[PDB]
Every structure is written in structure tokens, then in C-alpha cells.
Design a protein around this ligand. Structure first.
Ligand SMILES: Cc1nc2cnc3[nH]ccc3c2n1C1CCNCC1
Length: 290
């Protein structure tokens, strides 16, 4: 529970899109010597959005792991008539921007360490039966040069007891290019569909966030760049189901690409678990370093 009077705006961070994160100073001396926090708020609050935002707050509050952005609290702002989420602020920002800026510096050994940390945070989510549904480098944060955290849980879902999947049908936009085929065809989300998206995340790291090599640019190039609207989806589905995949990024080792391909399996049941992935990645790193 943060006091609204001591919460001062700084900059924006990520806009919604049904939500927005700001950089704020928590400064309740008012001295201007204060802790910098990340503040999430509703962009177009409504009854369904508030119920959804409350679920998101409970999701993050329930998570305590080295590879998950720390939940700080809530602010009952505009005098206990508005709800805002308080999370820790990470100066290094998104992994996406971090890798775009320091690409020379960040070598393969380093990308695998980040890859492994994402797996571990993903493993912990599975422990609580949470489906992230939105794995992407822009949703991963850098704490320091040696550590990454999963930084957003806006689309996160709790699986019903003993359910393997959650069918969610939503209006509006979806990050189609990070979706598993069954998520595109039947709105089915599961740990396995998070494994598929993780495979796309690994692809993003190895392309070093080079624009012309991004999953949307690569799929559109395979689909045909002319296509608009619904025709993109039809073509994406047909391509994926008949094993059309993202190409191997330039200079990416074959063993690392094989990991990506195993995650991109049309058979949900045949996709590796996050524990299998963290083990393989850590062994590869260890068989390079140690
Ligand atoms: C871009 C960015 N930098 C952040 C630092 N700390 C944060 N703590 C929580 C978010 C968060 C930050 N973000 C993004 C992450 C993805 N959604 C928008 C904000």
C-alpha cells in the first residue's frame, strides 16, 4: 500500500494497449531522495478490466523468484477510488532494448545465460499453474549485465484445477507471430504454448534484435508482404501446420537452433518442458565455460 501523495511521475515506460507503466519516485519525505518504482495503471478502466487487473496484481504478489520482477504493492489512488500496481524499477530496461544497444559486447555465452534464466522463471510459473501467454524479449527486463527477469504479467492466466489448457477468446489484437498453432486455431493456451513462444524468444536473442530479421518481418516475407487483415492469419496458420518455420539466424550455432525447432513442434505433447530446456541450456553453457 503506497501513498498517492508521495508518488511522483517521471517518464513513461510501456504504454497500452489496455495498460501503461510509468517510472515514478516514491518520495515521502518529499526531500527528492527517494526510491524509483515502476507504476502500472489501467488505460481505459472498466468493470472487466478492473477484475482482470486485480487478478494480475494477485498473480505478481504470489510470485517470489530471482527471475521475476518484484511486486512492491498497490496504490489506491484518487483517494481510494483508483487502483495502480507498484513493481520494482529496473534501470537497464527491456532485454530487447538492452541487446539492441550492446550487441557487440553480448556474446553467445551471455545470451544462453539470459535464455536459461527465462526458463527458470517460466518453471516457477508452471509451479503455480500460471500461463504467461505473452513471452517476448520486450517483456523481459535486465536487472544487471548478468541477470534478466520476466517483467510483465498482463495476459497471465491460472489453469483450472487439473486443466492442461485455458481456452481464452479475446477481441482485439494478439501477438500472432509469437503464438503456437493451437493458440491461433483454437484459442488454446498452455505451458506447451509458452514453450513455443519461448522458442521465438530464443530466436529473437540470436537475431540480436536486427529489424529485418524480426519474427513479423520473417513470417510476412514467407506469407507475402502485400497481404492484409485476415489473409495474414489464414496463411500463418497453413504455413505453421505444414512446418514452415523461422529461419536459423546468421551465426547462430546449430545446437541452439535445434532447441528453437523442438519448441516449435505442432505436437503440443512433444514439446520439451521448461525444466528440460533450463538443463540443456545450462549444460551447453557449462560445456563452453567450465
Ligand atoms: C521498458 C521498461 N523498463 C522497465 C523497468 N522496470 C520495470 N518494472 C516493471 C516494468 C518495467 C519496465 N519496462 C517495461 C516492461 C514491459 N512493459 C512496460 C514497462
Amino acid at each position: 500500500q503506497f501513498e498517492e501523495r508521495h508518488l511522483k511521475f517521471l517518464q513513461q515506460l510501456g504504454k497500452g494497449n489496455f495498460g501503461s507503466v510509468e517510472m515514478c519516485r516514491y518520495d515521502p519525505l518529499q526531500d527528492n531522495t527517494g526510491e524509483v518504482v515502476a507504476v502500472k495503471k489501467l488505460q481505459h478502466s472498466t468493470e472487466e478490466h478492473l477484475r482482470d487487473f486485480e487478478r494480475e496484481i494477485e498473480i505478481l504478489k504470489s510470485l517470489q523468484h530471482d527471475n521475476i520482477v518484484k511486486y512492491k504493492g498497490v496504490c489506491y489512488s484518487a483517494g481510494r477510488r483508483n487502483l495502480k500496481l507498484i513493481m520494482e524499477y529496473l534501470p537497464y530496461g527491456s532485454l530487447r532494448d538492452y541487446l539492441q544497444k550492446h550487441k557487440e559486447r553480448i556474446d553467445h555465452i551471455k545470451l544462453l545465460q539470459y535464455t536459461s534464466q527465462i526458463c527458470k522463471g517460466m518453471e516457477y510459473l508452471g509451479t503455480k499453474r500460471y500461463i504467461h501467454r505473452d513471452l517476448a524479449t520486450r517483456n523481459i527486463l535486465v536487472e544487471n549485465e548478468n541477470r534478466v527477469k520476466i517483467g510483465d504479467f498482463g495476459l497471465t492466466k491460472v489453469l483450472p484445477q487439473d486443466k492442461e489448457y485455458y481456452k481464452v477468446k479475446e477481441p482485439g489484437e494478439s501477438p500472432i507471430f509469437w503464438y503456437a498453432p493451437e493458440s491461433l486455431t483454437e484459442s488454446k493456451f498452455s505451458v506447451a504454448s509458452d514453450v513455443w513462444s519461448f522458442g521465438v524468444v530464443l530466436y529473437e536473442l540470436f537475431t540480436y534484435i536486427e529489424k529485418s530479421k524480426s519474427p513479423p518481418a520473417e513470417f510476412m516475407r514467407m506469407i507475402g508482404n502485400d497481404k492484409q487483415g485476415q489473409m495474414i492469419v489464414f496463411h500463418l496458420i497453413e504455413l505453421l501446420k505444414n512446418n514452415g518455420r523461422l529461419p536459423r539466424p546468421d551465426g547462430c550455432p546449430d545446437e541452439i537452433y535445434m532447441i528453437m525447432t523442438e519448441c516449435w513442434n505442432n505436437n503440443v505433447n512433444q514439446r520439451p518442458s521448461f525444466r528440460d530446456l533450463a538443463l540443456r541450456v545450462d549444460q551447453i553453457r557449462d560445456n563452453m565455460a567450465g
